[PDB]
Design a protein around this ligand. Structure first.
Ligand SMILES: CCCCCCCCCC(=O)N[C@@H](CCO)C(=O)O
Ligand SMILES: [Zn+2]
Ligand SMILES: [Zn+2]
Length: 250
């Protein structure tokens, strides 16, 4: 009925201009933000939520030089942060995983997807379709021959693991509502809100369709009012200071 353990796994970092976490701010200060993956230990097996950054980001802060985000996004990734290495240190190989869940196919969430060539990768149809043509998607995040499990809308992965369709930040973004043995209800917003203030205070942040993103935040607030979960945001430096991280779990 519940997930046995929910692990927060640091998967490197990325510098992002602060105007991407609060659209009102003047550009020109970068923030060193966490990149997360999550590992769910379930009765049916281990499930990995997101896959970190692509190998091209390893020791390559200048990855986005020459692109429309030059100077605004700089990966902070070492060899240790490649998802296969993270998993091996934790105690898994890619073919051990039951599912991969892609919140969305942005570069720091699906950069590791190519490592999983057998495991089904659960991703929203609207996200998959966007990734095929929109400029903000890297080739590494939309590789053609992976075992995609394309879904549409809300979806129950296994008992205790619910996906909530939360488009706006990206065209097919999805968040997770998890029931854990130790903590009960947990909401992982992922990038439906980078920070607590994006969520609680509806502070605008980077997104494909900010209006739609706000509607998804409103939807999540309805879920929160009903379920009273503990809530974790996508790239929140303040919250990171108090997060239990691997080998601790919730
Ligand atoms: C030109 C190749 C792709 C350029 C990537 C554009 C960035 C799109 C927005 C994005 O992926 N933001 C990241 C946060 C900062 O790394 C995210 O959604 O987590
Ligand atoms: Zn994103
Ligand atoms: Zn993100």
């Amino acid at each position: 009925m519940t997930v046995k353990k929910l692990y927060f796994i640091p998967a490197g970092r990325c510098m992002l201009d602060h105007s991407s976490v609060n659209s009102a701010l003047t550009p020109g200060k970068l923030l060193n933000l966490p990149v997360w993956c999550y590992l769910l230990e379930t009765e049916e097996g281990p499930i990995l939520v997101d896959t970190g950054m692509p190998e091209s980001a390893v020791n390559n802060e200048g990855l986005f030089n020459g692109t429309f985000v030059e100077g605004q996004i700089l990966p902070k990734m070492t060899e240790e942060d490649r998802i296969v290495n993270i998993l091996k240190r934790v105690g898994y190989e890619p073919d051990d995983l039951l599912y991969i869940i892609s919140s969305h196919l942005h570069w720091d969430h699906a950069g590791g997807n190519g490592a999983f060539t057998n495991t089904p990768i659960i991703v929203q149809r609207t996200e998959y379709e966007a990734a095929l043509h929109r400029e903000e998607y890297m080739k590494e995040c939309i590789l053609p021959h992976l075992n995609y499990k394309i879904i549409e809308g809300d979806y129950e992965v296994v008992p205790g693991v619910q996906l909530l369709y939360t488009p706006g930040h990206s065209p097919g973004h999805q968040s997770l509502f998890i029931e854990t043995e130790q903590s009960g209800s947990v909401l992982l917003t992922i990038d439906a809100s980078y920070t607590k203030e994006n969520f609680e205070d509806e502070v605008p942040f980077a997104g494909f369709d900010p209006e739609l993103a706000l509607s998804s935040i409103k939807r999540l607030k309805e879920v929160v009012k009903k379920e009273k979960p503990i809530i974790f945001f996508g790239h929140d430096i303040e919250q990171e200071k108090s997060c239990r991280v691997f080998p601790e779990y919730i």
